[model samples]
Target: MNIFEMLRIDEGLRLKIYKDTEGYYTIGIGHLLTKSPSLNAAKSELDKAIGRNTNGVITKDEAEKLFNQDVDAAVRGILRNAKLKPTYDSLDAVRRAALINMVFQMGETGVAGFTNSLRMLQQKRWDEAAVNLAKSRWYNQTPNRAKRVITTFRTGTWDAYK
Candidate 1:
């Protein structure tokens, strides 16, 4: 199976937001609530996806679209928060994807806190960036995820997670 299919299977599909086993509010394939959703924002998206009623459910295609929208937002957030210049824009696709994925998991604010790693990334010091990331609290909390991301950065390979 493809990586996205595997991730969906591993994360499990949810058409509506619900509390996970740890009580974190999550939705659509394991996307945890990081930023509090504004009522207006919720209504705007909910109205389009599942209407504004009490009970709202989304189709699989809608869920996937939501996931893509969230990821695209995260990527835009990284670009804005990182203040990336043209040099950063010219980096290897794998490294860019790894950084974007990190921002996706940790949120832009959390990823922006990694000043050293971001500096290394900007400097094109791939190994240093990877190793520095390994020493972070994020890595401590999610070693396998960090490892895969670090491997991607170091080797410039999309297959690192595979």
Candidate 2:
């Protein structure tokens, strides 16, 4: 019903920090513990926990807070990457969210490599952008996520896969 709900449903909410399919330690609605600025703080918290180790878990509330920080950082990353054309506020909510999600997945530097896709996106060429997105190694490596983003781009619909 809302953007947050669409994102949560697509990302699969998780209360615990666990290794994702790609072996990254993730928690709280797809937040990457390894890359987030909260990593050292989380580690310190774990070190202080009597029996906690790397397998430590956090409450959903804590995870949500972390997710907020992570999402903010992702947005900032997109802004900082010069190669990622089209300003952050230029696109609609769904497209902007999709771009942010891509930055989260690939890093701003990595996503910036999709110049063709971003170009088509900037031009509002939906089908071209979708096709360009599908051509990336990111797509080959994660077809499910790639399809979801590409479909969202093509359809201008949040949570298009659903």
Candidate 3:
């Protein structure tokens, strides 16, 4: 598939992920996944996470701040079992978004700290990739959302979000 088209899929999934949460976006894998104390009111809450830390919309320096080191560590506990690693690609939005989603569900410290999972992703093993993606602390927490993203990745279709 074309890169642009691929990104559209990624964008749609990302939107759906956040939208399903009523606009809140998680940032890490399991334990690293941090959320606002309150449910998001809209998409703007995403901005707060984009450029800040796990502390919510208080400062810009902490953007993208949700990581494994969060002392309170809401999402970190699950990372040990989920076993993921950080994914960073200046290109490939779908891959990037998937990485973010996975890590957010896992947590900054847990998933970002993994060695084996990172190697698999670096090699582009998408089937294993999707499998690892679904195994998260939040997996049972939000079965419907998990199924939607898993189906979206598996089928390359965008209708799962609705």
Candidate 4:
């Protein structure tokens, strides 16, 4: 629910392919098709969604559908993380959304590396948790989005969402 909107704002929408910051081919809300293994497979699937070739263009509906699947993966990834599951379940909606945003961008594996931050966050030490997040490469790589997510984590409110 919250993820759908948050990612829409964060990732933005692009129906055509472009290189992500890492210079890999991506499309449709940061769908990194070049996990370096799926370029051919992904292209076929994108074309199938339109029932015809559109020369690397995907429809809005298809893009949204892809985003939903990615969101589900992000949501499920946290719950599947043993260390994060307990903390995630105990947090409020806004706080949980912040973590989910990270998971979406960094993936569950990258997020699990935030051990110290999760420890502080699990303890509800808002400032400590926020500071920990700030010191990360994740934050440094994407301060624009991470700043908002961090504020949500610290405040445990809807203020960052606006």
- Return the top candidate by lDDT: 4
Tens digit of lDDT per residue, candidate 3, span 1-162?
332233233333221223224344443221112255454432345454454332333332342133224322432333344444233532144455444454444446655654654666666665775677566655566676566655554444445643
TM-score on alpha carbons, each prediction: 0.73, 0.79, 0.39, 0.88
> Candidate 1 vs candidate 3: which has greater TM-score?
1
- RMSD of every candidate to native, in Å, equals 4.3, 4.4, 10.1, 2.5
Candidate 1 vs candidate 2: the TM-score winner is 2
Q: Which candidate's TM-score is highest?
A: 4
lDDT of 1 by residue, 49-96 (tens): 544453445668777876777666766776666354333486776677
Please give the lDDT score for candidate 4. 0.82
Model 2: how far residue 31 lies from native, Å: 1.9
The 10-residue segment of model 2 with minimum total lDDT is: 46-55
Model 3: worst 10 consecutive residues (lDDT sum) = 11-20
The residue pairs that clash in candidate 2, if any, are none
lDDT of 2 by residue, 82-114 (tens): 776464556787788788778877788888888
TM-score of 3: 0.39
Full ranking by TM-score? 4, 2, 1, 3
Q: What is the lDDT of residue 10 in candidate 4?
A: 86
Query: How accurate locally, in lDDT, is each candidate?
Result: 0.66, 0.71, 0.44, 0.82
Q: Candidate 2: list runs displaced more than 4 Å.
A: 1-3, 35-55, 85-89, 159-162
